Protein backbone atom coordinates (compact mmCIF):
# COMPACT_ATOMS: atom_id res chain seq x y z
CA UNK A 1 0.00 0.00 0.00
CA UNK A 2 0.84 3.67 0.18
CA UNK A 3 3.47 4.91 2.48
CA UNK A 4 5.14 7.71 3.25
CA UNK A 5 7.63 7.70 6.30
CA UNK A 6 8.54 11.21 7.52
CA UNK A 7 12.48 11.48 9.38
CA UNK A 8 14.53 14.86 10.66
CA UNK A 9 12.10 16.75 13.25
CA UNK A 10 14.10 17.81 16.51
CA UNK A 11 14.37 20.66 18.86
CA UNK A 12 15.60 23.78 17.05
CA UNK A 13 16.80 27.28 18.45
CA UNK A 14 14.46 29.92 17.44
CA UNK A 15 15.43 31.75 14.15
CA UNK A 16 17.51 27.75 13.18
CA UNK A 17 17.20 25.34 10.25
CA UNK A 18 16.00 22.18 10.09
CA UNK A 19 15.82 20.18 6.68
CA UNK A 20 12.53 17.11 7.41
CA UNK A 21 13.17 14.24 4.85
CA UNK A 22 9.55 11.96 3.24
CA UNK A 23 10.47 8.53 1.98
CA UNK A 24 7.92 7.19 -0.46
CA UNK A 25 6.73 3.73 -1.25
CA UNK A 26 3.51 1.95 -2.87
CA UNK A 27 2.80 3.81 -5.83
CA UNK A 28 4.95 6.00 -9.09
CA UNK A 29 6.44 8.90 -6.64
CA UNK A 30 7.16 10.91 -9.88
CA UNK A 31 3.80 10.81 -11.55
CA UNK A 32 2.22 12.37 -8.27
CA UNK A 33 2.53 15.96 -6.80
CA UNK A 34 3.53 16.03 -3.14
CA UNK A 35 2.31 18.36 0.17
CA UNK A 36 3.24 18.88 3.44
CA UNK A 37 1.04 19.68 6.47
CA UNK A 38 1.26 20.03 9.78
CA UNK A 39 -0.77 19.91 13.20
CA UNK A 40 0.26 22.34 16.07
CA UNK A 41 0.50 22.25 19.71
CA UNK A 42 -3.08 23.39 19.89
CA UNK A 43 -4.21 20.41 17.33
CA UNK A 44 -5.22 22.59 14.22
CA UNK A 45 -4.29 21.43 10.96
CA UNK A 46 -2.57 23.48 8.51
CA UNK A 47 -1.27 23.04 4.94
CA UNK A 48 2.51 24.19 4.71
CA UNK A 49 3.59 23.33 0.89
CA UNK A 50 3.01 21.92 -2.29
CA UNK A 51 5.31 21.06 -5.03
CA UNK A 52 4.41 19.63 -9.34
CA UNK A 53 5.12 16.17 -10.02
CA UNK A 54 8.57 17.24 -11.38
CA UNK A 55 9.42 19.95 -8.38
CA UNK A 56 9.24 22.80 -11.60
CA UNK A 57 6.09 25.05 -9.11
CA UNK A 58 6.21 25.22 -5.80
CA UNK A 59 2.98 26.76 -3.29
CA UNK A 60 2.97 28.22 0.31
CA UNK A 61 0.85 29.38 2.14
CA UNK A 62 2.01 33.50 3.91
CA UNK A 63 3.15 31.80 6.94
CA UNK A 64 5.98 30.06 5.57
CA UNK A 65 6.57 31.59 2.30
CA UNK A 66 10.16 32.42 2.20
CA UNK A 67 11.32 30.97 4.60
CA UNK A 68 10.18 27.32 4.02
CA UNK A 69 11.30 25.49 0.65
CA UNK A 70 9.89 22.43 -0.28
CA UNK A 71 11.74 20.09 -3.03
CA UNK A 72 11.85 16.33 -3.96
CA UNK A 73 14.71 13.58 -5.41
CA UNK A 74 12.58 11.44 -7.32
CA UNK A 75 16.15 9.49 -8.05
CA UNK A 76 15.46 8.91 -4.33
CA UNK A 77 11.88 9.04 -3.92
CA UNK A 78 11.81 11.53 -1.51
CA UNK A 79 10.65 14.60 -0.30
CA UNK A 80 11.98 17.52 1.98
CA UNK A 81 11.24 20.36 3.54
CA UNK A 82 13.77 22.88 4.34
CA UNK A 83 12.57 25.37 7.24
CA UNK A 84 15.08 28.26 8.58
CA UNK A 85 14.35 31.44 10.45
CA UNK A 86 12.19 29.04 12.64
CA UNK A 87 9.77 30.78 15.04
CA UNK A 88 7.87 29.13 18.03
CA UNK A 89 4.83 29.59 15.36
CA UNK A 90 6.23 26.85 13.42
CA UNK A 91 6.31 24.08 16.34
CA UNK A 92 4.42 21.00 15.23
CA UNK A 93 4.33 17.77 14.16
CA UNK A 94 4.91 17.63 10.62
CA UNK A 95 3.30 15.39 7.94
CA UNK A 96 4.27 14.12 4.25
CA UNK A 97 0.97 13.91 1.99
CA UNK A 98 0.35 12.43 -1.01
CA UNK A 99 -1.57 15.34 -3.52
CA UNK A 100 -3.40 17.03 -4.06
CA UNK A 101 -4.29 16.02 -7.63
CA UNK A 102 -6.71 17.22 -10.12
CA UNK A 103 -8.00 13.67 -12.04
CA UNK A 104 -10.83 11.45 -13.38
CA UNK A 105 -12.92 14.97 -13.33
CA UNK A 106 -12.47 14.46 -9.51
CA UNK A 107 -10.51 16.86 -6.69
CA UNK A 108 -7.90 14.12 -4.97
CA UNK A 109 -6.87 16.56 -1.67
CA UNK A 110 -4.02 15.21 0.24
CA UNK A 111 -4.10 12.23 1.23
CA UNK A 112 -2.10 8.87 2.47
CA UNK A 113 -0.74 11.16 5.40
CA UNK A 114 2.50 9.87 7.11
CA UNK A 115 2.39 9.44 11.07
CA UNK A 116 4.61 12.76 11.17
CA UNK A 117 8.21 13.98 12.64
CA UNK A 118 8.09 16.80 15.40
CA UNK A 119 9.49 20.04 15.58
CA UNK A 120 9.91 22.53 18.45
CA UNK A 121 11.08 25.55 18.29
CA UNK A 122 12.44 26.63 21.53
CA UNK A 123 15.58 28.31 23.44
CA UNK A 124 15.50 25.86 26.25
CA UNK A 125 17.50 22.96 26.00
CA UNK A 126 16.81 19.77 26.02
CA UNK A 127 16.24 17.36 29.11
CA UNK A 128 16.19 13.65 29.11
CA UNK A 129 13.24 11.79 30.96
CA UNK A 130 13.45 9.85 34.45
CA UNK A 131 12.01 6.83 33.88
CA UNK A 132 10.46 4.99 36.78
CA UNK A 133 8.60 1.55 37.43
CA UNK A 134 5.33 1.92 38.91
CA UNK A 135 4.41 -1.41 41.19
CA UNK A 136 1.64 -2.48 43.78
CA UNK A 137 2.73 -1.02 46.91
CA UNK A 138 1.10 -4.18 48.21
CA UNK A 139 -2.16 -10.28 45.65
CA UNK A 140 -6.17 -9.02 45.46
CA UNK A 141 -6.85 -9.13 41.83
CA UNK A 142 -6.73 -11.63 38.82
CA UNK A 143 -5.87 -8.98 36.72
CA UNK A 144 -2.51 -6.31 37.71
CA UNK A 145 -1.93 -3.49 36.27
CA UNK A 146 1.51 -2.52 36.43
CA UNK A 147 2.46 1.33 34.90
CA UNK A 148 5.92 3.49 34.32
CA UNK A 149 6.30 6.81 34.76
CA UNK A 150 8.30 8.84 32.02
CA UNK A 151 9.24 12.32 34.12
CA UNK A 152 10.78 15.87 33.19
CA UNK A 153 11.40 15.50 30.01
CA UNK A 154 12.03 18.55 27.05
CA UNK A 155 10.39 18.52 24.43
CA UNK A 156 8.04 16.21 23.37
CA UNK A 157 7.32 13.36 22.23
CA UNK A 158 8.86 10.13 23.74
CA UNK A 159 7.69 7.06 22.61
CA UNK A 160 6.48 4.39 25.28
CA UNK A 161 6.23 0.39 24.55
CA UNK A 162 6.16 -2.89 26.64
CA UNK A 163 8.52 -5.60 26.35
CA UNK A 164 10.16 -4.25 23.50
CA UNK A 165 6.33 -4.19 21.59
CA UNK A 166 5.89 -7.69 22.32
CA UNK A 167 2.85 -6.68 24.56
CA UNK A 168 0.03 -4.27 23.37
CA UNK A 169 -2.91 -5.31 24.50
CA UNK A 170 -4.54 -3.69 28.18
CA UNK A 171 -2.03 -0.22 27.32
CA UNK A 172 -3.19 2.94 28.14
CA UNK A 173 -0.56 5.73 27.12
CA UNK A 174 -1.45 9.43 28.60
CA UNK A 175 -0.78 12.77 26.84
CA UNK A 176 1.81 14.34 28.54
CA UNK A 177 1.20 17.56 30.92
CA UNK A 178 3.45 20.12 31.67
CA UNK A 179 4.96 21.63 35.15
CA UNK A 180 7.66 23.75 35.33
CA UNK A 181 8.69 24.05 31.59
CA UNK A 182 9.14 20.37 31.79
CA UNK A 183 6.52 17.05 30.55
CA UNK A 184 5.98 14.34 32.44
CA UNK A 185 3.85 10.86 31.24
CA UNK A 186 2.57 7.65 32.37
CA UNK A 187 1.48 4.56 31.03
CA UNK A 188 -0.49 1.54 32.52
CA UNK A 189 -0.66 -2.07 31.40
CA UNK A 190 -3.36 -4.48 32.86
CA UNK A 191 -1.69 -8.33 32.76
CA UNK A 192 -3.42 -11.05 34.33
CA UNK A 193 -1.75 -12.06 37.61
CA UNK A 194 -0.59 -15.36 36.62
CA UNK A 195 2.05 -13.28 34.22
CA UNK A 196 3.36 -10.82 36.42
CA UNK A 197 5.99 -11.43 38.31
CA UNK A 198 6.40 -14.94 37.46
CA UNK A 199 7.70 -13.96 34.18
CA UNK A 200 8.97 -10.25 32.74
CA UNK A 201 7.74 -7.11 32.15
CA UNK A 202 9.18 -4.22 31.17
CA UNK A 203 8.71 -0.59 29.85
CA UNK A 204 10.72 0.65 26.88
CA UNK A 205 11.11 3.90 26.84
CA UNK A 206 12.86 6.69 23.71
CA UNK A 207 12.98 10.23 23.48
CA UNK A 208 14.85 10.67 20.52
CA UNK A 209 16.01 14.77 21.22
CA UNK A 210 17.99 13.61 24.06
CA UNK A 211 19.37 10.08 22.48
CA UNK A 212 17.45 8.48 25.55
CA UNK A 213 16.78 4.81 26.02
CA UNK A 214 15.60 3.22 29.00
CA UNK A 215 14.66 -0.46 29.16
CA UNK A 216 12.96 -0.49 32.84
CA UNK A 217 12.31 -3.84 34.66
CA UNK A 218 9.34 -3.68 36.73
CA UNK A 219 9.94 -5.56 39.39
CA UNK A 220 7.72 -6.60 42.77
CA UNK A 221 7.82 -4.43 45.76
CA UNK B 1 -7.96 32.28 4.13
CA UNK B 2 -10.82 30.92 3.82
CA UNK B 3 -12.24 30.40 7.34
CA UNK B 4 -14.10 26.71 7.89
CA UNK B 5 -16.72 26.50 10.99
CA UNK B 6 -17.46 23.58 12.32
CA UNK B 7 -19.97 24.13 15.32
CA UNK B 8 -20.62 22.38 17.55
CA UNK B 9 -16.83 21.73 18.58
CA UNK B 10 -18.49 18.20 20.71
CA UNK B 11 -21.35 16.26 19.49
CA UNK B 12 -22.57 13.13 20.95
CA UNK B 13 -24.43 10.08 19.35
CA UNK B 14 -26.15 7.10 20.66
CA UNK B 15 -25.00 3.64 18.67
CA UNK B 16 -26.90 2.72 15.39
CA UNK B 17 -28.05 6.67 15.57
CA UNK B 18 -27.58 8.50 12.69
CA UNK B 19 -25.70 12.31 13.39
CA UNK B 20 -24.55 15.16 10.72
CA UNK B 21 -21.60 17.33 11.66
CA UNK B 22 -21.68 20.60 9.42
CA UNK B 23 -19.07 22.74 8.08
CA UNK B 24 -19.73 26.66 7.28
CA UNK B 25 -17.35 28.45 4.86
CA UNK B 26 -16.37 33.17 4.91
CA UNK B 27 -16.28 31.86 0.69
CA UNK B 28 -17.94 30.11 -1.69
CA UNK B 29 -15.94 27.13 -2.76
CA UNK B 30 -16.26 24.11 -5.38
CA UNK B 31 -15.77 21.38 -3.12
CA UNK B 32 -15.38 20.20 0.39
CA UNK B 33 -13.16 17.26 1.81
CA UNK B 34 -13.59 15.52 5.16
CA UNK B 35 -10.67 13.46 7.24
CA UNK B 36 -11.04 11.56 10.45
CA UNK B 37 -8.52 11.54 12.52
CA UNK B 38 -8.39 8.67 15.07
CA UNK B 39 -6.26 8.28 18.59
CA UNK B 40 -2.63 8.68 18.24
CA UNK B 41 -3.14 8.37 13.75
CA UNK B 42 -2.72 10.59 11.34
CA UNK B 43 -5.61 12.02 9.66
CA UNK B 44 -7.17 10.00 6.93
CA UNK B 45 -9.58 10.72 4.22
CA UNK B 46 -12.92 10.03 4.44
CA UNK B 47 -14.71 12.18 1.79
CA UNK B 48 -13.53 14.14 -1.41
CA UNK B 49 -15.14 16.12 -3.43
CA UNK B 50 -17.66 17.15 -1.52
CA UNK B 51 -19.48 13.82 -1.87
CA UNK B 52 -17.08 10.57 -2.52
CA UNK B 53 -16.29 8.09 -0.74
CA UNK B 54 -12.59 7.32 -0.20
CA UNK B 55 -10.94 3.73 -0.66
CA UNK B 56 -11.91 1.77 2.63
CA UNK B 57 -14.31 3.76 4.22
CA UNK B 58 -17.64 2.29 5.19
CA UNK B 59 -20.68 3.06 3.44
CA UNK B 60 -22.40 4.50 6.37
CA UNK B 61 -20.38 7.82 5.66
CA UNK B 62 -21.94 10.27 3.24
CA UNK B 63 -21.56 14.07 2.24
CA UNK B 64 -22.81 16.48 0.63
CA UNK B 65 -23.07 20.77 -0.12
CA UNK B 66 -22.59 23.64 -2.29
CA UNK B 67 -21.43 27.40 -1.72
CA UNK B 68 -20.49 27.67 1.80
CA UNK B 69 -22.31 24.95 3.68
CA UNK B 70 -21.07 21.62 3.30
CA UNK B 71 -21.79 18.12 5.79
CA UNK B 72 -20.70 14.92 6.82
CA UNK B 73 -23.33 12.32 7.99
CA UNK B 74 -23.04 8.67 9.56
CA UNK B 75 -25.88 6.85 9.07
CA UNK B 76 -25.49 4.47 12.09
CA UNK B 77 -22.92 5.16 14.16
CA UNK B 78 -20.55 2.80 15.68
CA UNK B 79 -18.35 2.83 18.39
CA UNK B 80 -15.08 2.94 16.01
CA UNK B 81 -16.40 6.43 14.60
CA UNK B 82 -14.74 8.17 18.43
CA UNK B 83 -12.87 10.31 15.98
CA UNK B 84 -12.11 14.08 15.37
CA UNK B 85 -13.49 14.96 12.04
CA UNK B 86 -12.10 17.82 9.92
CA UNK B 87 -13.20 19.62 7.01
CA UNK B 88 -10.97 21.13 3.92
CA UNK B 89 -10.81 23.02 0.82
CA UNK B 90 -8.49 23.21 -1.14
CA UNK B 91 -10.28 25.11 -3.83
CA UNK B 92 -8.60 28.48 -3.12
CA UNK B 93 -4.82 29.42 -1.88
CA UNK B 94 -4.18 28.93 0.46
CA UNK B 95 -6.10 25.97 1.49
CA UNK B 96 -7.81 25.35 5.08
CA UNK B 97 -9.34 23.48 7.90
CA UNK B 98 -12.32 23.66 10.17
CA UNK B 99 -11.27 23.87 13.52
CA UNK B 100 -13.00 19.84 14.13
CA UNK B 101 -15.85 18.11 15.79
CA UNK B 102 -14.97 15.62 18.08
CA UNK B 103 -17.77 12.65 17.94
CA UNK B 104 -18.75 11.38 21.35
CA UNK B 105 -19.85 7.80 21.72
CA UNK B 106 -22.73 7.21 24.59
CA UNK B 107 -22.81 4.22 26.76
CA UNK B 108 -23.39 3.15 30.37
CA UNK B 109 -21.63 4.50 33.16
CA UNK B 110 -18.65 2.71 34.33
CA UNK B 111 -17.09 3.07 37.63
CA UNK B 112 -12.86 3.04 37.03
CA UNK B 113 -10.77 0.07 37.82
CA UNK B 114 -8.64 2.19 40.11
CA UNK B 115 -4.60 1.52 40.81
CA UNK B 116 -2.46 3.33 43.04
CA UNK B 117 1.36 3.33 43.28
CA UNK B 118 3.78 4.44 45.65
CA UNK B 119 6.94 6.67 44.59
CA UNK B 120 9.31 4.19 42.76
CA UNK B 121 12.67 3.36 45.44
CA UNK B 122 14.48 4.13 42.58
CA UNK B 123 12.47 8.07 42.45
CA UNK B 124 13.27 8.59 45.82
CA UNK B 125 16.93 8.24 45.74
CA UNK B 126 17.20 11.05 43.44
CA UNK B 127 15.27 13.26 45.97
CA UNK B 128 11.98 13.61 44.62
CA UNK B 129 8.75 11.32 45.33
CA UNK B 130 5.52 11.41 42.90
CA UNK B 131 2.57 9.05 44.04
CA UNK B 132 0.48 7.70 41.18
CA UNK B 133 -2.72 6.64 40.19
CA UNK B 134 -4.96 5.52 36.88
CA UNK B 135 -8.49 5.58 36.67
CA UNK B 136 -9.12 3.17 33.68
CA UNK B 137 -12.26 2.45 31.12
CA UNK B 138 -14.62 4.69 32.84
CA UNK B 139 -17.61 6.58 31.60
CA UNK B 140 -18.73 9.26 31.58
CA UNK B 141 -15.24 11.62 30.57
CA UNK B 142 -16.30 13.92 33.53
CA UNK B 143 -14.85 12.07 36.75
CA UNK B 144 -13.30 13.80 39.53
CA UNK B 145 -9.91 12.88 41.53
CA UNK B 146 -9.05 13.30 44.84
CA UNK B 147 -5.85 13.06 46.62
CA UNK B 148 -5.96 12.36 50.47
CA UNK B 149 -2.14 12.63 52.60
CA UNK B 150 -2.79 11.14 56.69
CA UNK B 151 -6.71 11.66 55.66
CA UNK B 152 -6.49 15.31 54.72
CA UNK B 153 -6.86 16.33 50.85
CA UNK B 154 -4.17 17.38 49.20
CA UNK B 155 -4.68 19.91 46.02
CA UNK B 156 -1.43 21.29 44.74
CA UNK B 157 1.10 19.51 42.79
CA UNK B 158 -1.16 17.31 40.67
CA UNK B 159 -1.33 16.69 37.22
CA UNK B 160 -4.26 15.21 35.32
CA UNK B 161 -4.03 13.39 31.53
CA UNK B 162 -7.16 12.01 30.24
CA UNK B 163 -7.03 9.40 26.98
CA UNK B 164 -9.50 10.10 24.17
CA UNK B 165 -12.33 7.76 23.77
CA UNK B 166 -11.58 4.03 23.66
CA UNK B 167 -12.63 2.86 19.80
CA UNK B 168 -13.78 -0.25 21.22
CA UNK B 169 -15.48 -0.20 24.58
CA UNK B 170 -16.58 3.60 24.65
CA UNK B 171 -14.37 4.28 27.94
CA UNK B 172 -12.01 6.56 29.09
CA UNK B 173 -8.84 6.24 31.02
CA UNK B 174 -6.87 8.93 33.16
CA UNK B 175 -3.68 9.28 34.72
CA UNK B 176 -3.52 11.29 37.77
CA UNK B 177 -0.07 12.19 39.52
CA UNK B 178 0.56 13.53 43.09
CA UNK B 179 4.37 15.53 42.47
CA UNK B 180 6.00 15.46 45.99
CA UNK B 181 9.49 15.75 47.27
CA UNK B 182 11.36 13.28 49.12
CA UNK B 183 11.09 15.19 51.96
CA UNK B 184 7.61 15.57 52.37
CA UNK B 185 6.87 12.10 51.65
CA UNK B 186 8.66 10.50 54.71
CA UNK B 187 6.65 13.19 56.69
CA UNK B 188 3.13 11.29 55.97
CA UNK B 189 2.44 7.67 56.09
CA UNK B 190 -1.31 7.42 54.67
CA UNK B 191 -1.91 8.05 50.98
CA UNK B 192 -5.40 7.84 49.13
CA UNK B 193 -6.76 8.93 45.72
CA UNK B 194 -10.27 8.64 45.03
CA UNK B 195 -12.13 8.94 42.18
CA UNK B 196 -16.37 10.01 41.80
CA UNK B 197 -18.65 11.26 40.05
CA UNK B 198 -22.94 11.04 41.42
CA UNK B 199 -20.27 5.72 45.77
CA UNK B 200 -16.67 6.51 45.04
CA UNK B 201 -13.74 3.89 44.15
CA UNK B 202 -10.76 4.60 46.40
CA UNK B 203 -7.28 3.01 46.87
CA UNK B 204 -4.43 3.60 49.26
CA UNK B 205 -1.11 2.69 50.86
CA UNK B 206 0.89 3.48 54.06
CA UNK B 207 4.44 4.46 52.94
CA UNK B 208 5.16 1.96 56.35
Known amino acids: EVKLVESGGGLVQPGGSLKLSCAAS????????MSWARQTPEKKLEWVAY????????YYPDTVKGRFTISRDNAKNTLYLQMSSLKSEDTALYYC????????????????WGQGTSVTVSSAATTPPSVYPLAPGSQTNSMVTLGCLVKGYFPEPVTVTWNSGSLSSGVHTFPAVLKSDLYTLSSSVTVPSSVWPSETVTCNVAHPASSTTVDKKIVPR | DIVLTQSPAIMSASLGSSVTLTCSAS?????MHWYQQKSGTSPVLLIY???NLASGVPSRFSGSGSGTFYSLTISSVEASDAADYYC?????????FGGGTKLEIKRADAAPTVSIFPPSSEQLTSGGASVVCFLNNFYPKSINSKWKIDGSERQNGVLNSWTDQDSKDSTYSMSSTLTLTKNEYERHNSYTCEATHKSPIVKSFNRS
Open chain 1, 97 to 112: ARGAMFGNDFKYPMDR
Open chain 1, 26 to 33: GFTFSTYT
Open chain 1, 51 to 58: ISKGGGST
Open chain 2, 27 to 31: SSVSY
Open chain 2, 49 to 51: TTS
Open chain 2, 88 to 96: HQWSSYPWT
